[PDB]
Structure 1
Amino acid sequence: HHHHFNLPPGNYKKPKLLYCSNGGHFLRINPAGTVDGTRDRSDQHIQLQLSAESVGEVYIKSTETGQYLAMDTDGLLYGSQTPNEECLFLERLEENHYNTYISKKHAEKNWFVGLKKNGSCKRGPRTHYGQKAILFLPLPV
């Protein structure tokens, strides 16, 4: 293992909004396959269904389009039509409260899902433990 194993509570029964306390944006997977954030709670591309592939390993999928969140070889988040190795994330508890998501494929490099204060996603290499950009709270839809 490259990382700890404190897991968040909650489950995967219902879809969630992934709220980033850094700028208050919800993670959004656009139909074109781009990924960013928005503060508009009425957006139809922020409702995400998570599922556990293995304990602590999840897929994050848009319920509106069926796309899977994924992180590419250069660290950019994208929406994938089919599940692949870039779509698995290590879901962990952080600061005894938040949920963080580490790219399983690049877990040794500590590449997280993260949103900047301006709503743009962070590139894997620019994320790291300790940032506010990587802290999420799953909210009910």
Structure 2
Amino acid sequence: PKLLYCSNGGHFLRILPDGTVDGTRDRSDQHIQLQLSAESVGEVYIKSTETGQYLAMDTDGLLYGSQTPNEECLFLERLEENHYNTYISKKHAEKNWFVGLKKNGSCKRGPRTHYGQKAILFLPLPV
């Protein structure tokens, strides 16, 4: 029962019911309560506790909400040097595509992500 805070512009990661991932700063928002559930070690699904949608990155690197689970919904967790976390699309691990948000709280597509950005750091917060 966790919130994922993005260091970049200070948004909590948010899966809107229509599949559009983005960020909000509103703590009472329903769609930010997430559940991180480990398949293997350092291999998680990221799910909304409010819609049951799964976070997923498609072929273009666009993050969306997946209504059912699958290959695209798995992400590689890495704890970073501070207390923050990065998350790679397992299905696109080679392409080194992270979950990330821009500074205005919008999805920063995989292609345009990379290491050393503040877009890709997230701080899990127990709700």
Q: Same fold (TM over 0.5)?
A: yes
Q: CA deviation at 1:93?
A: 1.2
What CA deviation, in whole Å up to 9, does each residue of 1:96-141 have, x standing for no partner?
4210100001111110000111000110000011111000000121
Q: How many matched pairs?
A: 127
Distance 1:17 1:73 in 2: 26
Paired residue secondary structure (1:92): strand
What CA deviation, in whole Å up to 9, does each residue of 1:36-92 have, x standing for no partner?
000000000000001001011000000000000000010000000111100000000
Corresponding residue for residue 61 of structure 2: 75
Distance 2:113 2:80 in 1: 14
Q: Does 1:140 align with 2:126?
A: yes
Distance 2:48 2:88 in 1: 18
Alignment gaps of 5+ in structure 1:
1-14
What CA deviation, in whole Å up to 9, does each residue of 1:2-44 have, x standing for no partner?
xxxxxxxxxxxxx100000110000000011110000000000
Paired residue secondary structure (2:17): coil
Paired residue secondary structure (2:72): helix
Paired-residue identity, %: 98
Distance 2:54 2:44 in 1: 10
Distance 1:114 1:76 in 2: 10
Runs of 4+ in 1 over 3 A off after TM superposition: none
Paired residue secondary structure (2:51): coil
TM-score by length of 1: 0.88
Distance 1:136 1:82 in 2: 24
Distance 2:69 2:124 in 1: 22
Q: Does 1:108 align with 2:94?
A: yes
Alignment gaps of 5+ in structure 2:
none
> Which range moves more in the overlay, 93-102 or 67-76?
93-102
TM-score by length of 2: 0.98
Corresponding residue for residue 60 of structure 1: 46
